[PDB]
Amino acid sequence: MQIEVTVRNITPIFSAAPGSNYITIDGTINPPPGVSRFPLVRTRMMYVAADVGDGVIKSVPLQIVPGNTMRSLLRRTMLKHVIEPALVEKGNKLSIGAYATAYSGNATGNPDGVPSSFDEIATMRAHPFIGLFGGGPRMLEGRLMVDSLYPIHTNAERILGAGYENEMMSGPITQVVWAFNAHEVVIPGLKWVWRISLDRPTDAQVGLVLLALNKMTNERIAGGHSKDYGRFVIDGVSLNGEQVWSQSGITGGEQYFDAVAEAIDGLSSKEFEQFAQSAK
Amino acid sequence: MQIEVTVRNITPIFSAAPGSNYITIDGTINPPPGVSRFPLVRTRMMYVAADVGDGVIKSVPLQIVPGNTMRSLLRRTMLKHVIEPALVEKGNKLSIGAYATAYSGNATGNPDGVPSSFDEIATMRAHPFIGLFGGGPRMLEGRLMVDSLYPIHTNAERILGAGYENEMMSGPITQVVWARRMDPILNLGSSEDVEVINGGAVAANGWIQDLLANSKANGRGLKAFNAHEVVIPGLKWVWRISLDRPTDAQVGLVLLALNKMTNERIAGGHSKDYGRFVIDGVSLNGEQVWSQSGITGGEQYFDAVAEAIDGLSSKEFEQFAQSA
Amino acid sequence: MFVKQVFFDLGARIHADEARALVAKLLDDTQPGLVSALMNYMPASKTSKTEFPLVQFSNFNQGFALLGFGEVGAQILSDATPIIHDAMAKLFASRGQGVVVQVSSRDVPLSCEKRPYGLQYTVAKMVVQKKHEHRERLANPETGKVFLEGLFLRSLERQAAAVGMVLPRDLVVSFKGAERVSSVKLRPDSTLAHGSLRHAVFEVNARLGGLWSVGFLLSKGFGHINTDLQLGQG
């Protein structure tokens, strides 16, 4: 529900881009001829309309972390940090296909084109995780809408023009790190905006997203696990635009946290098996 | 009555064009076969005669959100934030036919052959919702005509004859954005994560053996890799919502939808946040009425629609949807 | 043509020859035809074939891996994978808490093109001596050099002939040096050992575009490396 966090990276970010790219040296990034080819895995590309040239609007490059990856990040943080640890007691162990439908979108391929009856979608979009992350056999839409990670940049000004007059990154953002094959990463210390959106959500769903954002620092995204890429820290979480973050955590809007705590206290596996069972 | 809604998208716009398109690793949309083509669902495209060079007009591409899509979007935001709160505050109860005819123009797929009597036409066209969006079994014509969503680009230069001669974008506005699936049971690793799965690690290993048996060998497993072409974010579009002899209540309902358009999404791709936008301006027969706090102006239309929410019953929807 | 590479993850590293011995022991009781094809045995008895090994083990950081050269080896690998994976699943679930066995696959194509400039390739764990005459050749560098050149060229030629693709016969090779000299053992606690080179560097004018195996003891995971990694690796 218009949840917008800002994060700071400390290590490089490597959200690799699909491309057959190659470099010779830092003077030219993609050479025309094939002398001294050294292959490149680019970071993720986002051409964007921006005010470059003092008045005109042009497509310019800018490097992001995609919202599909952070949607999977928010998903795995909640599933592996409260949903599995508050599911590990009192029985109710997940099915294997239920675990696939919780971690991925579906249990398997070929989702059945038979739709589900409404008493399902009424029960599932009210439950904290399933209505947050829809899909499965019926490809349920869900409520939670995950934006891609936008660096607070001069190319990113028209998207982020309202709340940020200052703290505005300019010039180069990215650099090449070799190890003879080259890799392209985002320089650390950049401030990013990650936007989380939900339509008409229940108290437990926004509490779950909020609880996950209390603890988002631990899991590393968009880089090599061996290469130490992915560390980030969060300052400035906004909840309908009002600042709800400190060093110790959220400390604000406690009705959301009470609601989701009562929800995972009442969490059961039956809704997850009613998700993942492909009614073909 | 002409309304020109000039908007700026916040997120990328993805309104999927039908058509099984294909994409290589680097560019080359729809390659010759055998270069390992990946599936590609492009954004909705519109060919436009445009001034390419001096004296030549060619059918160039320019990719849009369809006018059917935003006609249903304006209709859906009208129903979700004006008509349904009114009908639940007064307790007026729709039928399944009235509900389906309100959101989809018809109740069933078979329209009635007979035409509606003229008193019924006058009542449902003086209705501030049904007059905007007609349909029904007797196939009513709505007063509202919704154009498709044109970006302010050189390609739409012949389209934007009046206004928008500035803010004139030259280069390309689309992007191939890649999204993949994994099988996360192919990413388990530790059996302490598998102790949540009932039956132990043997069932997870059976799913490993299932996907390797699929890999040597048409039941699809998981772990896809797909691309979709989206519009870039941050570019400014124009929308045209015109009206055919409107009552002031119908215009007030359109402006009530335009006040809180920004909650809804002008795209598909719901989970990827695609479709977030902010309205830069709203032109009411050329005059600008848009502010940061909704619409500043058009007070007679709003007053007319405030008198139209009062006196609004479900009965008009019911004999609009009732088939002879 | 193409060679298929199957990676098996158990959470701990086991050596390729030790994995070969371990794989034979678990399946010795049941399904002997699958074991015969995997180890390249003669269809009648236990003795392995004299020809080029289509199926060979290799190295994997968290376990071991299988290489199947050509369509026949790929099919043998394709039908072998579920039974072997279930065998490790039962073996590692019999003792301890249990570990998830994780698989991976690649279908690396093979190619070769002749270029008029020398190209460098390094091979690790290279067994070169198997009779006394090769030990006599290795004493003098001049008469051991041409032996190593002929061994490398005949290895490339027999792998091209076994995979079913044509190799140009105007290739020239050159050997620069090897970092270390070490022995290998056929079986543990055996007095017999075979001499071997470690981190040997070779220079071929032509280029290679896939997994290439050279020399002796190919089925033990000895002396093959991915050339496709080594183009511009540095």
Give the minimum alpha-carbon distance from A32 to chain C in angstroms, rounded to a whole number. Answer: 17
Would the CB atoms of B169 and A49 count as touching at under 8 Å?
A: yes
Beta bridge partners of B59: B49
CB interface of B with A, residues 143-182, below 8 Å: 167-173, 175, 177-179, 181-182
> Which residue among B188, B189, B212 places its CB closest to the CB of C85?
B212
CA separation for the pair B308, B251 (Å, rounded): 11
B-C CB pairs within 8 A amount to 47
Interface check for C232 against chain A (CB to CB < 8 A): the answer is: yes
Would the CB atoms of A93 and B232 count as touching at under 8 Å?
A: no
Closest of B75, B274, B208, B262 to residue C82, by C-alpha: B208
Provide the terminal-to-terminal Cα distance of chain A, rounded to the nearest Å. 34
C160, C167 contact by CB (below 8 A): yes
Q: C222: helix, coil or strand?
A: coil
Give the minimum alpha-carbon distance from B193 to chain C in angstroms, rounded to a whole number. Answer: 10
DSSP annotation string for chain A = --EEEEEEESS-B--B----EEESBTTBSS-SS-SS-EEEEPBPB--EEEE-SSS-EEEE--B-B-HHHHHHHHHHHHIIIIITTTTSSSS-PBPHHHHHHHHSS-SSSS--SSPPPHHHHHHHTTSTTTTTS--TTTT---S-EE--BEE-BSTTTTTT-SS-SSS-B-S--EEEE----EEEEEPTT-EEEEEEE-SS--HHHHHHHHHHHTTTTSS--SS-TTTTTT-EEEEEEEETTEE---SS---S-HHHHHHHHHHHHT--SHHHHHHH----
Resolution (Å units): 2.8
Give the minimum alpha-carbon distance from A36 to chain C in angstroms, rounded to a whole number. Answer: 8
CA nearest B206 in A: which residue? A96
Give how far Cα B282 sits from Cα of A159, B30, B259, B290, B294, Å.
19, 39, 10, 5, 10
Residues of B in contact with C101 (CB under 8 A): 205, 208
Interface check for C143 against chain B (CB to CB < 8 A): the answer is: no
Give the minimum alpha-carbon distance from B205 to chain C in angstroms, rounded to a whole number. Answer: 6
Would the CB atoms of B196 and A84 count as touching at under 8 Å?
A: yes
Closest of C143, C118, C123, C119 to residue C133, by C-alpha: C143
